[model samples]
Target: HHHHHDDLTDAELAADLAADAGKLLLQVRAEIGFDQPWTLGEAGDRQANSLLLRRLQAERPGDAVLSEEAHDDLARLKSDRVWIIDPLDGTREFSTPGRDDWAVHIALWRRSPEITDAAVALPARGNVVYRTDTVTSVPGTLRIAVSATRPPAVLHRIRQTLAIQPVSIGSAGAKAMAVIDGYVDAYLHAGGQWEWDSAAPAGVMLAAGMHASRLDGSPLRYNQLDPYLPDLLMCRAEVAPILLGAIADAWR
Candidate 1:
């Protein structure tokens, strides 16, 4: 066959880029080892960033890009097709020995005020990639995914009203994917995040028939001039009403 990527659609391209970048991270870890966690994390972030940027430049030269590892070019604000990426999400988890929660994120934001396509790759977990084109389908009993370190206080409030099982994990993509993968019933976060943090996961979660929104149950918007997205909530549709109500009452 000719080049495999030559005929890929944007969704496929995003998936391919994310998966390849994740594979590169796995190689970097294998070569560098986990003795110096800081070094390993830095190397993985840099090398994966380089790979994703290089590939995107070659594959979609005209489209703009926003990466966690690069400068924020406001010029992308003018382009209709912008790719938002986080080459190595959950760097702390990635640097640690034998943590498979890290991920690679790639998402396309179009002028229609939507994330049109996206993919997330969990390289350590059998090189798995979740794409918007492929819908992963459900959950029950309200198992919520929480950050291992900085879970929000709203979770405490939610527990006051409903019985929920909290599963702690790292990485925005990993936590969100946990919800879409039926590992958790919901994922709620606050106090810190960026556009690259939530773009790909939100895109894929939306496609998977999950409810994606801000903690206040508003829509999650991407490709903005200011990329500081502080909080988000992604969950099973049946749980949104309860979760949103609990969060609302907690903050009130």
Candidate 2:
């Protein structure tokens, strides 16, 4: 969950973050050429994210930055404020013929010994789902957002174990929003992913009384020198244990 705040305006902060994220998304989409596969998408996403991070760092130089497409800067770990970003999540979707699941994500975190707090995730495609400031709200039932490209065995087991519901969305950020908006209860990605892929959405979920962690229920860490973070589980606090158990069993 997000760290507490005494004077910060959560709503206003969310709006500002959303605006910046949207701008980055537009810039990336516009600059990217409509040819080639993963290379163009990767290059475009990286460039856009780097540009956004540079802007944010210029405005707040004290803040650290960790991004997916950009090279890792170990200097961020020394700072108190850090930005975790993914310029264009879902590069595969972007390369596909007809899909809009790709999105830009930006999340801010204040590093702490026990937990990384004060998290937020902004989805570029806000028209499809509602946005909220908090991560844990039991007003609705839990749901799991699965990728359309998920393997068959994984999909079947997810359906059989939990009250699984398949939700089709682009980008890890958008899938996380599906959970935040009550479209689904949780979003778990056990496959390969980097820190940038989950940081922004994890922030949003944490604020909403949700949990994003390793399968063992450890807190998610960011701003490390290395950028590869391959596994994550995002869900409500109540059901996290259950999902973690399922994940453990299926893999065994």
Candidate 3:
């Protein structure tokens, strides 16, 4: 199908990949909605993974790929251009139609783990995919989205300190997308994550002129020797310094 994105830029292609994967997941779920939850989960994960792997291999043959559904392939470490993907970012949530926080992530890391190009498709939101090149921050309230799956209680103190309300969301991409969409002023996560968990969101967040980095204000590196990125803090540019300062204070 026109090689999926023969004429698109890296950012555009990332959007396409993530958006397409999300669509595919929706279709698969519809076709097999009657199946058991675990069955549906595996089916969605495998089917979406297949869709991404084939498109990436054909379009970016020279690049290495790291996918959550696929076996670990350390070969990506040697290539400067690597594609990191989370085909079905919220398997459990996806299996349950009531949950809309599911997402599909696609990102390209060049020379380092920092996502150079990326997209996160929040299919529950009308197939809306946040592309690194196109998304702009909306005026936000003094609120933050925390991980519902990994709720860090320290957030209460952080929120009280910053005077921001706390909202809970699912999936790393979905939480990050909430911040980019200005649905929340920021997203704070300290409950452990992998490169696949944050890569695409990081690109989209940074591209939208938001601040994205470790809580300690270090750069988030990707395709690393270790993918266990421990924490993240994404917020509006204006509030970032204050949030970071409060986070440092909370740490001490």
TM-score against truth, every candidate:
0.95, 0.74, 0.91
**Each candidate structure's count of clashing pairs:** 0, 14, 1
Candidate 1: regions farther than 4 A off: 1-5, 138-141
Clashing pairs in 1: none
Candidate with the greatest TM-score versus the true structure: 1
- Residues 1-252, candidate 1, lDDT per residue (tens digit)? 654447789999999998899889999999999899999999999999999899999999999999999998688999999999999999999999979999999999999899999999999999899999986662335788988878887678778878888899999999998888778888989988999999999999999988999999899988788999999999988889988888888877
TM-score of 2: 0.74
Whose TM-score is higher: candidate 1's or candidate 2's? 1
Question: How high is the CA lDDT of each candidate model?
Answer: 0.91, 0.63, 0.85
Candidate 2 per-residue lDDT, tens place, 1-252, comes to 354452234344433544565565545555665577666676656666766666665565666667766666587768777767666677777656556666666666665732243333333355232234544563233456777775224546755655666666667876777666667777777666777777767766776778889766677777766767767788767778777887777777
Q: Once model 3 is optimally superposed onto the true structure by TM-score, how far is the C-alpha of residue 187 displaced, in angstroms?
A: 0.5
Between which residue pairs do clashes occur in model 3? 113-222
Two-way TM-score contest, 1 vs 3, winner: 1
Better of 2 and 3 by lDDT: 3
Give the number of the best model, judged by lDDT: 1
Error of 3 at 129 (Å): 1.2
- Please state the error at residue 9 of candidate 1 in Å: 0.3
The Cα error of candidate 2 at residue 46, in Å, is 4.3
